[PDB]
């Protein structure tokens, strides 16, 4: 049989607004920050890592083509473990996660590293007549971080298809206002709180009047009333749209990661665990209705860990927009009150490629809170794909 | 224990040259071709595939974050079936197959698609200042294909690490020129008697005189004659340089995929299968010694495979550099007769993101061809790693 | 002999910042608006215009190559009238001054307008590889701004050429930073006054909260001290420096035009003009001394003229670095209190197109002011020149 | 009264195609060339210049808005000469020739070098979003060269307003055919014959096979015949078009100027001068229709001159597109012999900003030839104006 996968740590970052706090910070650099901090939040040295995978969606320089590689080797990981970057789109962080437990479940490895990281931020603009010219006519710069958020199959942006998932699973406009609003105030008592301070790694951001921690989700609105939303208009259609910029998520920069082990591994070392991994699972859906993807996935996940939906006691489930967040709490008879108790996608922000492994840590961590048993860690997935995992707390 | 997983399918396009045949055709559009020609070789629907995983570095476009996803689709794989892009640099074509077969060994899936894509010629420039400006002074528009040819730690060519592991494993610049020339004349062999006939899938290439079939690697020299190396300088440092552009891998596009199965699923098909999956291995090497990273990768998976070097009747070790390429095949103790018998980089090509998956496509047919059992696959990776495989003909 | 030149009518823009309040509005918008305006002024209907010329340096965007004739068009000129665009580099405005004059005094014409547009906000990024295409390597956006800005000689910035200037003809730092705080002083007072309200063409502004009106010279510090200017580090050279940010001139968008008629259609409309020209002149000077250009320039003038330096009762000479207009003033033996009475470069900015024809409305406004006679107009010029122009109040 | 000025020399290059044997010439480095080379043809000092003047419309680089000033520098002029640049599109050489005359009639110098020069194969591609970003959406690569082909008003290019001028002057496609060929034929003939060779400057175009002398126009077609051109489609609309590829002009880099003297100063020399200044007008047109721009201006010239048309023993009226120049030979009742005799825009190409300057060298060269009186030098420019000037040879 498979062997059994442990998380014994870790972190991640604040996130970032748009051309905010983290902007000159590159992905390889913030990557390498969390390979650095998981580390030592596990007592494991550098030179004992069996694997390294990294979520990443959008390359912003050449370096990021080796971003696992650069994060593990600037975050003090030795040369002699592999390194692999992961692209699942919005899922990619926790595919870097799920891959990465893949190599200790078949024996290639006892620890392995699995982590995300995305500047938004720092997407760039390419020039595909560059190479070898235009001669005559006007070109174009293409915005590889909209590229990125269009479907490549009709070339709608992905809050067309939030519209088609409200349209087909009657989730009205105040609906979705309705869950943004409620995601900023949890974010909001969460961070009045301290709830995030133990998983956060602050960065010190230099500035002209000096060196300041950022240690704190920015994209949070901590005054936001129901008004704030309603007066807002839609973005995506220009008829009868209910997806505005307020229940959209946020673009946003950030990187996390965990450091698991094989059970022996873990129990050799006496460590003192976050959780252990119970099962994953992927789905495909039509792209079109991207939005509900975390609903099939999630549906296998819970067969292969034997659970029911009662038995999760916390559920992370990422808001891309209110318009599909709804639908699938809706489709999978969740307790809303249960599903980002502290917020997510819509109030602390959105690094796609760092969002998957982003949120595990905030699912880990509310486990620790409030004394839970089973995490549920789901996704959306541009082009039609879900993603989720189940862990334990133990 | 671990599932057994069986290759029942392959096939590549021909490798075209920088700027040549498949310049007009993006990694999706390649991706997609390959897809849909594994299905029809194994004679399965596009219905019954569990996991497409492709290996690809270079984005070209927005798509291409899509790229495993966009292949599958258009390739005629059913909306419901997860799809990976995976970057290992130079192994992601290898990486790929590798990937696809976990999900197979885990019980994740029974069917399985793993290849990959690259595209050099259309590789873009970025320009990382056009979001946010540059306000004053000059930027810089930066190649993301020579970028990506760099070392990230030391910022050098791949070629300078090709010179490291010459002068630190004493090949020698007649040593380098003579691969070289057999590469050229193995691989002219290979295409005058036909051996890439029933691997390559053909492609259209419209053109203004009418569609002609593109079929044939067009980076293989026929005329090559020994003179035809020597009168080349090096190109990668300015003393004592043994690196040329005649005796280093190409710039290519090319795609390739693979089509695996559950041997229980194999089985009740009946399909007529080309090999068996029997270990792979990864290893991590010094950066600047890149090109020795398949020396400990090909150690440790003869070592899960129970097997030794003298087992292998067939080997595709990238010819990423004839510098690295010798030293590969010295430090291992390889026949060189049994190393590459139909060329490799620097005659046929080098599609980064492909060249994993496209040389095991060789390994597997020339298995076929000389009525063999066992067969290796290995390549070096920029930035320290190697990556390998080994089949079983069945 | 050659006929006499009468100026009836005068008016600017206000001067807009580097990114600031102009930023939004073309070379060609603001030309034509002062078009528009000075043709009211003047009670000159569009259809009885002979020549219109406009001084303009760095080039937007397409409409840029056709900036005299879109000004006069959009406008209200008709398009019977010939329109010219020069470029003399910062002595452009006063260029197309002379050039339309010059229609006049040789009889081509009975009404020219002469006049500059210059939005250096606005100014471009070219790729020169853009067209036929880069291959492989990086290549540069090139800053056209900052290119114009450059000696094309030694390739230095304009103000390394002012630091040999200070050094050649002993400007002190303490010497540049007292005319630097005076000239903010100055305009500062004028705005207060409301010298410029007249000479000023308002601009409706668009903004978020309604449009307001722009109609104040943005650059100007009313609150400068004289430690404002002596905290301030050298910023062109590395040794020995004296130039700042804040003794050179700023960056700046604006347009300025007069229309001129000939004597005797002006006696017989009756008009009650501003100023007659009186002569003009040119130089050339070593281009790594562009900064005293004005000397000989302002020399030659006075020569045409008949005239003396104490004859000069408002001179309007641009304040492109403290370190030329001090050596200028130095050596032409001019009184620093006739000397830009009301600020320039320094204070007002230095929309390098328009900054001749704009210095000249403000010396003719001026001369009205206190009741003055003979104004010197006259400015330095990148790559050695001079330009020199003297009006009479009449 | 004013001035007489004398042409004492003149010299072009030979006409490059659009990224032909001059693609690597900048324009300013074909501006030194021809300026050296009229002061050695004149026998003047680079110390005895009073003024240079230069057309061009399309900057390639920032030296290049320094154009009169570098190309006067490097070719031998003294630092202390004036030097202007100036913009009325393609009357722009012919401008430049005019502004210097005009320094000789008004007496602000004696000797004087009109010119221009274009390269539009260096034309750039422009970002103007590169200064202050783009933040979201893709943004555009300005072709600066196809935009300065387009009218600034209707956004049309110059080849629709020559279809206007067809429709609205009876011009067939027959007739435009016609003379395209014969102008090809002409040139063709004035090529063989040699007749280009005297007012020609060699240039060297370092390749790789040696040094060769670029000395002929290489947009001719020797071989031409009508059905060259009854085969190609119009190129401009899409609906009853008549412009094509072969009856237009071509895009093309060339640089020309001419050494003038006053009189008073010619005479004191002992110069054998090529011809002297008669008279020279402008004239706006309908923009929409500016092809026959060339019509009022030519008429006013010769009240001026107090000259008829069948005075006019070689007339250079530029074939920008030979529906243009069919209806200007038309209104203005010219003998097509004495029209064009060697070619024009169509055959020999169009280097728009030297062009004016280009074709009044070919005017006097041929009064040398044909022991001719008086010549006129006209053109069409974009925008809707005209602009003539009648020489007399001597
Ligand atoms: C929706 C989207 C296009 C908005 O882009 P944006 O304009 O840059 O968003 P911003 O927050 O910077 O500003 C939007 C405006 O709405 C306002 N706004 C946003 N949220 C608000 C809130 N909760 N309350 C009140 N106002 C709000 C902003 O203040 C801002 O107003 P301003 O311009 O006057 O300052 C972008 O955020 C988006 O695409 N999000 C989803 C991305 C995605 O596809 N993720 C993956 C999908 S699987
Ligand atoms: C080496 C490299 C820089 C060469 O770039 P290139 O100039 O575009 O290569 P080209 O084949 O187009 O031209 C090179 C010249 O050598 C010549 N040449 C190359 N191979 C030759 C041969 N076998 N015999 C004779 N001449 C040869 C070419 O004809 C060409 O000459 P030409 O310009 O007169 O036509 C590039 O191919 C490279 O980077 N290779 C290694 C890439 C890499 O890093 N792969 C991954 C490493 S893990
Ligand atoms: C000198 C130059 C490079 C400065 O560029 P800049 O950085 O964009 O100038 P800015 O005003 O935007 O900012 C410069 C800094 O000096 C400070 N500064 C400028 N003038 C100041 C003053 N009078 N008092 C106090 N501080 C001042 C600014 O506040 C700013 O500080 P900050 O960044 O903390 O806000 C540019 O203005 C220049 O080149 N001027 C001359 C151009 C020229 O060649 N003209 C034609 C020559 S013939
Ligand atoms: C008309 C125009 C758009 C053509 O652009 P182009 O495609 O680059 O022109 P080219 O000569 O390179 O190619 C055109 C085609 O027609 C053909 N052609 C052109 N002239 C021909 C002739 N006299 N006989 C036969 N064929 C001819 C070319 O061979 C070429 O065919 P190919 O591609 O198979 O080789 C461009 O030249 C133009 O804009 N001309 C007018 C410019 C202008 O506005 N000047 C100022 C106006 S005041």
Do not use: W
């Amino acid at each position: 049989a498979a062997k059994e996968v442990v998380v014994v740590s870790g972190v991640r970052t604040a996130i970032g607004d748009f051309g905010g706090s983290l902007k000159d910070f590159s992905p390889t650099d913030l990557g390498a920050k969390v390979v650095s901090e998981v580390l030592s939040r596990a007592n494991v040295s550098g030179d004992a890592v069996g694997h390294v995978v990294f979520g990443h969606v959008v390359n912003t320089e050449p370096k990021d083509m080796y971003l696992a590689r650069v994060a593990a080797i600037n975050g003090g990981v030795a040369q002699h473990t592999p390194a692999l970057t992961v692209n699942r789109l919005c899922g990619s962080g926790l595919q870097a996660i799920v891959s990465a437990a893949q190599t200790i479940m078949l024996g290639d490895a006892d620890v392995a590293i699995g982590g995300g990281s995305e500047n938004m931020s720092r997407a760039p603009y390419t020039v595909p007549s560059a190479r070898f010219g235009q001669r005559m006519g006007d070109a174009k710069l293409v915005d590889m971080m909209l590229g990125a958020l269009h479907d490549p199959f009709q070339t709608i942006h992905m809050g067309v298809t939030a519209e088609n998932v409200a349209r087909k699973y009657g989730i009205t406009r105040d609906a979705q206002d309705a869950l943004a609003l409620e995601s900023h105030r949890r974010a909001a008592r969460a961070i009045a709180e301290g709830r995030f301070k133990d998983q956060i790694l602050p960065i010190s951001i230099r500035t002209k009047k000096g060196e300041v921690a950022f240690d704190t989700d920015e994209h949070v609105r901590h005054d936001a009333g129901p008004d704030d939303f309603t007066k807002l208009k839609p973005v995506f259609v220009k008829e009868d749209g209910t997806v505005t910029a307020g229940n959209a998520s946020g673009i946003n920069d950030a990187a996390a990661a965990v450091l698991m082990m094989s059970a022996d591994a873990a129990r050799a070392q006496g460590v003192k665990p976050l959780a252990r991994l119970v099962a994953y699972a992927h789905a495909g859906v039509d792209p079109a209705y991207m939005g509900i993807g975390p609903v099939p996935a999630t549906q296998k996940a819970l067969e292969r860990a034997g659970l029911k939906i009662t038995d999760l006691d916390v559920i992370e489930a990422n808001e891309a927009f209110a318009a599909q967040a709804c639908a699938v709490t809706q489709e999978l008879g969740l307790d809303p009150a249960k599903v980002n108790p502290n917020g997510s996608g819509i109030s602390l922000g959105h690094p796609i490629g760092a969002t998957g492994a982003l949120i595990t840590v905030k699912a880990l961590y509310e486990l620790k809170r409030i004394g839970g048993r089973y995490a549920l860690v789901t996704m959306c997935i541009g082009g039609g794909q879900g993603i989720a995992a189940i862990f334990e707390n133990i």
